[PDB]
């Protein structure tokens, strides 16, 4: 197939590009390097099955781009990713995550694209649901602008599906970690911890450290994207996680172990916009896509620390 | 109270301004005249309790405006209102209806505003719903970009409510009609019919004329805004309608009978994005707010025709 990946210079995006190429697809990457990194794609310089387009999804002529490249599937991973940043500038977050998605859908519906695979946020969209692990049937209740824009994006794509029959599915990951996650990013606790502990710099947890997340390895997430790209799960969201909770404090201990040395984080005040608890029910992805996560946290953390050592 | 009404130069907006003035409130009207008309407010030239601000919610410094006027309640009626226009340019519709709402909320949460009363769209947000009349508990399923943006607007305001305790309620009217509705657009069937039939100009219905809507009179809708402005229904949507379905053809007959001319509309192709049926369950507004619609269609049509006769 011809595939186009927005956010392709990023952590999950670049990993997805690699998988698609390995599966024998031709892949257009698109990114504006807001948070992405050239080194994430540098290995592809001589691969003729890959073409990279620098473009801002907010302002670029996406119609022209899609008309030129004719992707069958668009994997949409370009986004403002930081919850705290979304609180500080909700307009900017909404422009990238909502307007950007709308512009892409409008371009795609006119250029013969079969399907857009959206990236939602399984971690943030549910808020404080009565059910953990949380199924997709649980009402959304975003408590950050980031979460709100992600929901908004799903809704718009569902709208384009009704209007034009432009197919869509929403990949809703939990907390994704692994090789290529930015060590110096504002988000990405595993990368942050690995970076800090390997350089013997201070680390911190927020609140009393009891916040929980559902940590899912990047390769597992990438596999879900691939599975959902087919003519399946139309207009549906799929939670992509492990369905297991790890506290901030427990994760610190797990990274500290893999790195070796001290397990002694500082305790800082809670961050406005951050949920206290997150855990995804992944039953639908299994029943519908045949998808199951392969990597357990211990194994994944090893692989991640391994990566950060080599760099 | 100190009120601010966005979309104040518009149909519902100007009518709401009048009501708030009549109730003894001070009112700041805000509009950019995208679809609003100065003539809707000209009667206030020498009214001592209204001040007008010409501003675009997408780009103006709303922070400074709200800082100056310190409104307790913002009635948010500024929007791109045409479903077909939203299909033709979903980006523009999203910019006004989503980005504008976000900018407003972000300004409001910083300027001590107590509550934003949002205008959703009870007619469009449910798409094709499971049942008619449709209650607020029915899932949203927008099938036009306009509908999608209204849903997104609700969600963002709920988010700001979580973040900052900036209160919000969502007025979700059906199909509003009455004096001051612009007769020169493609939206606002009652006004379009009334002016055309009065002038002996051609009229049209779309498809086979069987589309139904729930026609609710502007004065009733305005009363709902007033009631919900108090500390009641935080984070909730209220359907505002009559719970009665009238077909396009039936509506044309009603307007023609009031005008007194022929009842012979042209039939034009169906409009992409337009739902076939709309009917709202108004039980929640009745219980919580004590709101009930007073004006039946026949009465409302008469009042509307008479406004256009003398204008
Ligand atoms: N990492 C997680 O835990 C996680 C889980 C759920 C959702 N997500 C979603 O996954 C996607 C990828 O995130 P990531 O973890 O790889 O982070 P990332 O920052 O590495 O990737 C995001 C990419 O989008 C690009 N981008 C941002 N704004 C853009 C714009 N206006 N135009 C073009 N490109 C733009 C960035 O430059 C970057 O390369 C995002 O949609 C994110 O919201 C991430
Ligand atoms: N008429 C209906 O049947 C109905 C029912 C449900 C929802 N609504 C909502 O009610 C509200 C009022 O609509 P209406 O029927 O009075 O239509 P209208 O066009 O008369 O009023 C909308 C007003 O918003 C203003 N506006 C638009 N974009 C703006 C911007 N960027 N900055 C500032 N002002 C801007 C317009 O100039 C206009 O005065 C809208 O939010 C509409 O979506 C209407
Ligand atoms: C629950 C939730 O909304 N999850 C989403 C959110 O992740 P988060 O915003 O939760 O990601 P993050 O890596 O910033 O935080 C994860 C966890 O680690 C903790 N922490 C973080 C940094 C640090 O130095 N120390 C520390 O303890 C933090 O308190 C939290 O409980 O955004 C991601 C994109 O960026 C994804 O969309 C996730 O699905
Ligand atoms: C069901 C629905 O989504 N309703 C919403 C939508 O109204 P609509 O988009 O339904 O409003 P409209 O006045 O454009 O059309 C109402 C009805 O009148 C018919 N018609 C219209 C014009 C004409 O010349 N002849 C004719 O027959 C049309 O086929 C439709 O069935 O948008 C409004 C804002 O603008 C509100 O948000 C409404 O809640």
SS (H, E, C) A77-88: CCCCCCHHHHHH
What is the DSSP secondary-structure string of A146-210? HHHHHHHHHHHHHHHHHHH--EEEEEEESEEESTT--TT-SS-HHHHHHHHHHTT---EEETTS-
Same domain, yes or no, for B209 and B219? no
Non-local CB neighbours of A250 within 8 Å, separated by 6+ positions: none
Helices (DSSP H) in chain B: which residue ranges?
11-22, 62-69, 83-88, 90-94, 100-108, 145-164, 189-198, 218-228, 248-259, 283-289, 297-310
B186 CB burial (10 A radius; 0-12, 13-18, 19+): exposed
> Distance from the CA of B180 to the center of ligand 2, in angstroms?
12
The answer, for B158 touching chain A at a CB cutoff of 8 Å, is yes
* CA-closest candidate to residue B307, choices B190, B187, B174, B176: B190
Chain B residues inside the 8 Å CB shell of A272:
163
Same domain, yes or no, for A123 and A50? yes
Same domain, yes or no, for B36 and B51? yes
Pair of tokens at residue A143: 């408590």
* 3-state SS, residue A75: strand
Distances (CA, A) of A108 to A95, A130, A187, A236, B94: 18, 37, 30, 19, 17
Same domain, yes or no, for B167 and B247? no
For atom 14 of ligand 3, the residue with the nearest CA is A187
> Distance from the CA of B78 to the center of ligand 2, in angstroms?
5
Same domain, yes or no, for B192 and B285? yes
Tell me which residues of B are annotated as active site.
146
Same domain, yes or no, for B42 and B160? yes
Same domain, yes or no, for A227 and A288? no
Same domain, yes or no, for A50 and A141? yes
Q: Are strands B246-247 and B212-213 parallel, antiparallel or unpaired?
A: antiparallel
Same domain, yes or no, for A184 and A232? no
Same domain, yes or no, for B208 and B229? no
In whole angstroms, give the CA distance from residue A20 to residue A40: 15
For atom 5 of ligand 3, the residue with the nearest CA is A123
Residues 166-195 of B with CB under 8 A from A: none
The half-sphere exposure of A287 on its side-chain side, counting CA atoms within 13 A, is 9
Total structural domains within chain B: 2
Chain B residues inside the 8 Å CB shell of A142:
155, 158-159, 162
Rg (CA), chain B: 18
Q: What is the domain extent for residue B84?
A: 1-177+214-241
Does ligand 2 lie within 6 Å of residue B13's CB atom?
yes
Chain B residues inside the 8 Å CB shell of A101:
none
Q: Which residue of A has its CA nearest to B105?
A: A90
**Contact state of A155 with B158 under an 8 Å Cβ cutoff:** no
**Contact state of A102 with B145 under an 8 Å Cβ cutoff:** yes
Cis previous bond, A133, omega within 30: yes
Residue B190 known to bind ligand: yes
Angstrom resolution of this structure: 1.9
The answer, for A102 touching chain B at a CB cutoff of 8 Å, is yes
8-state DSSP, B212? E
Distances (CA, A) of B54 to A231, B8, B81: 49, 10, 19
A215 is catalytic: no
Question: What is the Cα B300 distance to its own chain's centre?
Answer: 16
Say which residue the tokens 């019919």 belong to.
B193
Domain limit, last residue, from B205, B226, B241: B241
For atom 13 of ligand 4, the residue with the nearest CA is B188
Sign of the dihedral through C-alpha B144, B150, B152, B154: negative
In whole angstroms, give the CA distance from residue B63 to residue A37: 35
In whole angstroms, give the CA distance from residue B103 to residue B94: 13
For atom 19 of ligand 3, the residue with the nearest CA is A248
* 3-state SS, residue B280: strand
Least Cα separation, residue B156 to chain A (angstroms) = 6
Domain limit, last residue, from A241, A260, A291: A241
Mutation probe of ligand 1 site: the residue of A28, A38, A39, A78 with most atoms within 8 A of C-beta:
A78
Pair of tokens at residue B256: 């023609």
Experimental method: X-ray
Same domain, yes or no, for A61 and A206? no
Domain limit, last residue, from A241, A257, A291: A241
Same domain, yes or no, for B276 and B304? yes
Non-local CB neighbours of A60 within 8 Å, separated by 6+ positions: A32
Least Cα separation, residue B161 to chain A (angstroms) = 8
Residue B238 near residue B173, CB atoms below 8 Å = no
Count of CB pairs separated by less than 8 Å, A with B = 92
Question: What is the Cα A270 distance to its own chain's centre?
Answer: 23
Chain B residues inside the 8 Å CB shell of A95:
99
* CA-closest candidate to residue B20, choices B38, B36, B35, B8: B8
Rg (CA), chain A: 19
């Amino acid at each position: 197939m011809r595939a186009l990946v927005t956010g392709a210079a990023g952590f999950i995006g670049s990993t997805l590009v690699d998988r698609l190429l390995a599966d024998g697809h031709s892949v257009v990457g698109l990114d504006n390097f807001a948070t992405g990194r050239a080194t994430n794609l540098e290995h592809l310089a001589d691969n003729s099955a890959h073409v990279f387009v620098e473009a801002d999804i907010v302002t670029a002529d996406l119609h022209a781009i899609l008309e030129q490249h004719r992707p069958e599937v668009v994997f949409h991973l370009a986004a403002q990713i930081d919850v705290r940043r979304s609180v500080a500038d909700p307009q900017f977050d909404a422009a990238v995550n909502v307007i950007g998605t709308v512009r892409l859908a409008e371009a795609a519906r006119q250029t013969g694209v079969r399907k857009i695979v959206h990236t939602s946020s399984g971690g943030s969209i549910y808020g404080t649901p009565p059910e953990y692990p949380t199924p997709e049937t649980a009402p959304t209740d975003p408590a950050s602008p980031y979460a709100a824009g992600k929901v908004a994006g799903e809704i718009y794509l569902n709208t384009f599906r009704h209007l034009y029959g432009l197919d869509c599915s929403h990949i809703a990951p939990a907390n994704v970690y692994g090789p290529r996650q930015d060590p110096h990013g504002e988000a990405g606790v595993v990368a942050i911890f690995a970076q800090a502990l390997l350089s013997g710099k201070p680390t911190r947890v927020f609140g009393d450290g009891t916040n929980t997340r559902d940590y899912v390895f990047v390769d597992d997430v990438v596999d879900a994207f691939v599975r959902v790209s087919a003519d399946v799960g139309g207009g549906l969201r799929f939670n992509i996680g492990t369905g297991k909770e790890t506290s901030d404090r427990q994760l610190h201990s797990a990274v500290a172990a893999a790195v070796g040395g001290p397990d002694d984080p500082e305790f800082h005040p809670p961050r406005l916009g951050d949920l206290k608890r997150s855990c995804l029910d992944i039953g639908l992805a299994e029943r519908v896509l045949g998808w199951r996560p392969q990597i357990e946290l211990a194994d994944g953390v090893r692989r991640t620390v391994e990566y950060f050592r080599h760099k």
